[PDB]
Every structure is written in C-alpha cells, then in structure tokens.
C-alpha cells in the first residue's frame, strides 16, 4: 500500500507557496464536495443515526470521528470533527491543512439529507486539540 | 376573478382587533418571506438588472413598482416601493397594512442573490405618498 | 388591480402552520361575520327573493353562486354554494380554505331579524371540490 | 481480506425495511444459534472458566469482550458484552443490530449439558452504546 503522507506534505507546501490561502481553501472545499459526491450516507431519520452513518463513512477512510449537535438558539448544526489527518506543518493552525476538505465534505453529506434545493453553508469556527475541527452549518443568508 | 379586497379589509380589521400590532407585523413578515420563496428573481449582476427583475415580478402580481439604491456612506440598500396595494384603513399609516409583507418579500429577494452572507435586516422608514413604502436593508 | 391570490395562499399556509384548524376556522368565521356587516341583503320574506339578493351580493364580490332550499321535514335551510374561491391547497378538503368565511357570511346574511329567517344557525356539512354545503337550523 | 461492513450496513437496512423488527430479531437469534454450533467452548464447571473460554472465542472472532456474573438472589447469570460490532445505524438502540445474534450465541454457548449452566434461558435487558446486557434465568 503506497504512502502519500510525504507527497501530501510536499504538495501542501508547494500549493501554499505558489497559491494564496483563499484559493487553496476554495480548491480544498471543492475537493471535499467531490469526495462527498463519491461516498454518501443513507437517508437518515435522526441526528444520532446520521452521526453513526457519517462516523462509519469516516472510518471507511480513517479520517477521524464526528459529533453533531443541533443548536436551536444559535439556529445551526455544530459539527465537531476529531482526529483530522495531518499532512505536515501547513494550514491555520499548522497541521489543519485539510479543514476546507471537511467543510465541503460535511456540507455535501448533510445537504444530502435536506430538501431538493437548500442553500446551506458549513463554516469553520476560527483549548481545542490541534486536529479537532469545529464547524457550524446554517443557511447561507437570511433576513428578518 | 374573485375579489379579495373586502375579505382582506375584514381580515385586517379582525386581526388588528384580536392580536397586537407586533404579532400582525411578524405574521405579515413571515407571509412575505413565504411569498418570496414562491416567486423568485434570476441571479442578477447589478442593481439595475435586479430592479428590472423585481419590477417584473411585482407586475406579475400587480403589487406596485420598486426602486433600489445603494447607500455606501450609510452602508445600506434603500428600497422605495410605490403603489403598495391598499386593503382598508388598517396599518400605520392607515392603508399600509401590507407594508410588513414587503419587509419579508424584499428580505427574501435580496438575500437570495449571490454574494449575500449572514443575517440581514429590512426595516421600513417611520412628502412621501401614503402607499409609498421606504425600506432600508442592513446587516443585522 | 392588485392580485391577492399568491398572498392569500402564503397567508393560509402560514396561519395553518402556526395556529392549526379549529382556531383558524374560528378566525375565518369571525372574518365572515365581519364581512356580513359590510355587505347586507335587503330584508326578504321569501327564500327565492333571499337567494336572488344573496346571488347579487356574491356577484358584487365575485364569490361564486348560491342556492337555498327550505326543507319541509324540518324547518331548516340547505345552502349549496358553488364556485367558492380557491387559494392554494389549504383547507379540508384541499382547496376549500374560505369555507368558515362562508359560514359566518351566511349566518350574518340569512339571520336578519327584519326578514323571516332571523333565528337560524349555520352548521357546515360526488360534490364538486369548490362546492360548499351548509345547513341552517332554527 | 474482504470488508463486509458496508455490505452488512446495506443488508441491515434492507432487512429492517422489508420484514420489520421482530422477524429480523428472530432471524438474527437463529443466526446466533447457528454460530454457536460452529465455534463452541469446552465444558466449564465455573463461571470464571466459562468467561475465560467465551472471551477466547470472542477474541478468535473479534466480536468484543464478555463478563459473566452469578446472581445468588435467583442463581441467575448476568452477561455484559462490551464492544459489540457495529454494522450501521440500524437496531434498537441505533448501532446495535447484532444483539439478537449475541442472544442466540450466548444461549448456545452457556447452556451445555456437560457444563453447569445447561438449563438457562436468554433475555436481553449509562452503559455504552455497544455494550449489551443479557440475563440467563432458569
């Protein structure tokens, strides 16, 4: 089984060198969306079942664990991802280069449970452990 | 075609008599938000094109005309709606019962455009014609 | 002329979502009786004349047509209202959301004391979708 | 080595969708009883030795760990199985779909005539999600 850790470290270094943070983040978000397109959870009824299915999907590729919590007062879905794979000393903070991938992946995964056309965004919440990623899912925009 | 003018006048009278002003305003804002999800403009590029599309949508139902203007120094989007439909003497001022609906409607119409993010607020202003409604859109 | 069809559809959706059916029906009966205080028929001593006047009022507001029948087994009035305005799929059955409005309207119209049917009470009861059948019994 | 986790997730989904819960539970209990005829523990006269042998079998199949305790109030047997394999979000509670398999497996394993607990009956009843509590009663 080939190892891509060194290759991904070098690729992250090169991309950050020749490409800014925002462009790299957009590319990684699109990559996460494509990854979610490739692997899908089944249509779940509750948050607990969706969390179990997403954790099974993550264990299929060994990308960590996920916890989902619906915040009614915040009107959001807090997504806590633990043990994000590390591809070197890249990202903000260092070691979290694959966080936009998680943003896109979880956006696709949870939107798959929604209606036909929903406008939702997953945003990274910038003593949390280094590889733990906290994200919030909510509507893209709204007015009151 | 059935005429709902008298029914709407009576409905406004009974709602104002039964519930408060704020409850009615919130209900009408929600009604406008739901209306914005049934008829929608295409994704526009500039303010003028969005104004044209919103005017076409309003003419589809005959609810009046709109003018949009970006205030950079005040950091908002002034929305002036002319010829709002009138249903009786209810509302503040009298005859502007459906004014909160616009607050929802435009609120759904502009936040649905590409580039909108987060929470926004559409607030109506409190020389101007009676049926003319002036609203300002800001970030919440 | 402003079109209130889409607005009424969305309003019925929101009201049904927020308050339910019984509260909505009571509110619409209130609205119907309020509408009755705004348009009234002249005092009629005959069911046929009352039917003509009510149809004239309905044509004035465009809310369909009506037929009145005075049953003989019991002193009750059968009211068949055809072409009730439809605003969305709300109501039971779907499409009949302004039926309590008809209940209140016919309770106010028929029960004028200057006529002959001043002691009746409405009770809503193959049939077309937008056809509403109600009974008024003393 | 083939991975049957996704296949078992889909199979549990389909079986629960088609036949329901009680029929699925009975089928999985039968499957557990059949598994009890493939791998068997030696005849054990004590709870501790039987627990060691059952843990050895579970480590052989990698299905978790087990603790057995003898309750003297009724001479019953309490079975605590930790780290049951998870085959998706199916089951009651979610993630526990192979629990009837454990019921049948422990019913076949514990009740051996040459042993000392050959007259017991299975019964599944803050614990972790994959921890399964069973009771053996005469």
């Amino acid at each position: 089984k080939p190892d891509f850790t060194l290759f991904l470290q070098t690729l992250s270094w090169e991309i950050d060198d020749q490409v800014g943070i925002e462009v790299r983040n957009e590319l990684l978000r699109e990559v996460g969306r494509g990854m979610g397109t490739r692997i899908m959870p089944p249509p779940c009824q509750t948050v607990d079942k969706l969390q179990i299915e997403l954790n099974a999907l993550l264990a299929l590729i060994g990308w960590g664990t996920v916890t989902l919590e619906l915040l009614s007062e915040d009107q959001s879905l807090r997504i806590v991802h633990e043990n994000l794979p590390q591809v070197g000393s890249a990202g903000e903070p260092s070691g979290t280069w694959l966080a936009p991938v998680l943003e896109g992946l979880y956006g696709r995964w949870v939107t798959s449970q929604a209606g036909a056309f929903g406008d939702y965004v997953v945003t990274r919440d910038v003593a949390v452990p280094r590889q733990t990623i906290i994200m919030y899912m909510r509507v893209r925009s709204s007015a009151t | 075609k059935p005429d709902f003018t008298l029914f709407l006048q009576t409905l406004s009278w009974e709602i104002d008599d039964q519930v408060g002003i704020e409850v009615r305003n919130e209900l009408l804002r929600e009604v406008g938000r739901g209306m914005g999800t049934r008829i929608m403009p295409p994704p526009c590029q500039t303010v003028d094109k969005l104004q044209i599309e919103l005017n076409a949508l309003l003419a589809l139902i005959g609810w009046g005309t709109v003018t949009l203007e970006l205030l950079s120094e005040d950091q908002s989007l002034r929305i002036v709606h002319e010829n709002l439909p009138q249903v009786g003497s209810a509302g503040e001022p009298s005859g502007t019962w459906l004014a909160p609906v616009l607050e929802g409607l435009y609120g759904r119409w502009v936040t649905s455009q590409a580039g909108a993010f987060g929470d926004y607020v559409v607030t109506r202003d409190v020389a101007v014609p009676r049926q003319t409604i002036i609203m300002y859109m800001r970030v919440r | 002329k402003p079109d209130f069809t889409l607005f009424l559809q969305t309003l019925s959706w929101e009201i049904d979502d927020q308050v339910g059916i019984e509260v909505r029906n009571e509110l619409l009966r209130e609205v119907g009786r309020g509408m009755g205080t705004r348009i009234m028929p002249p005092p009629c001593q005959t069911v046929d004349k009352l039917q003509i006047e009510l149809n004239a009022l309905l044509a004035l507001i465009g809310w369909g047509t009506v037929t009145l029948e005075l049953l003989s087994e019991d002193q009750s009035l059968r009211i068949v209202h055809e072409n009730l305005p439809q605003v969305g799929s709300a109501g039971e059955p779907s499409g009949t959301w302004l039926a309590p409005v008809l209940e209140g309207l016919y309770g106010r119209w028929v029960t004028s004391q200057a006529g002959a049917f001043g002691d009746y009470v409405v009770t809503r009861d193959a049939v077309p979708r937008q056809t509403i059948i109600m009974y008024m019994r003393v | 080595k083939p991975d049957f986790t996704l296949f078992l997730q889909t199979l549990s989904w389909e079986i629960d969708d088609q036949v329901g819960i009680e029929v699925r539970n009975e089928l999985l209990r039968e499957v557990g009883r059949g598994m009890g005829t493939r791998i068997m523990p030696p005849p054990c006269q004590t709870v501790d030795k039987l627990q060691i042998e059952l843990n050895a079998l579970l480590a052989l199949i990698g299905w978790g760990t087990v603790t057995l305790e003898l309750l003297s109030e009724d001479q019953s047997l309490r079975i605590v199985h930790e780290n049951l394999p998870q085959v998706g979000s199916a089951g009651e509670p979610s993630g526990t779909w192979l629990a009837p398999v454990l019921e049948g497996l422990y019913g076949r394993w514990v009740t051996s005539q040459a042993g000392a607990f050959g007259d017991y009956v299975v019964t599944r009843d803050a614990v972790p999600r994959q921890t399964i509590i069973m009771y053996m009663r005469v």
Binding site: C44, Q45, V47, S72, L77, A114 | - | L27 | -
Partner: peptide, 28 residues
C-alpha cells in the same frame, strides 16, 4: 424519536421555524 432531533426538525430549525399568534388567539 430516539432522544435525538429528526433531520426534518434540524432543517426546520436551520430555516428558522424552531407573544405568538397561537397564544394571542387563545388569550383573546
């Protein structure tokens, strides 16, 4: 349910559906 919100409930809360008209009408 299973002690957890449903997906439909989650998306209703995200949309914003989570005095009031019902309470005002009951009071009156």
């Amino acid at each position: 349910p299973d002690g957890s919100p449903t997906m439909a409930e989650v998306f209703m809360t995200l949309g914003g559906r989570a005095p009031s008209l019902r309470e005002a009408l009951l009071r009156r």
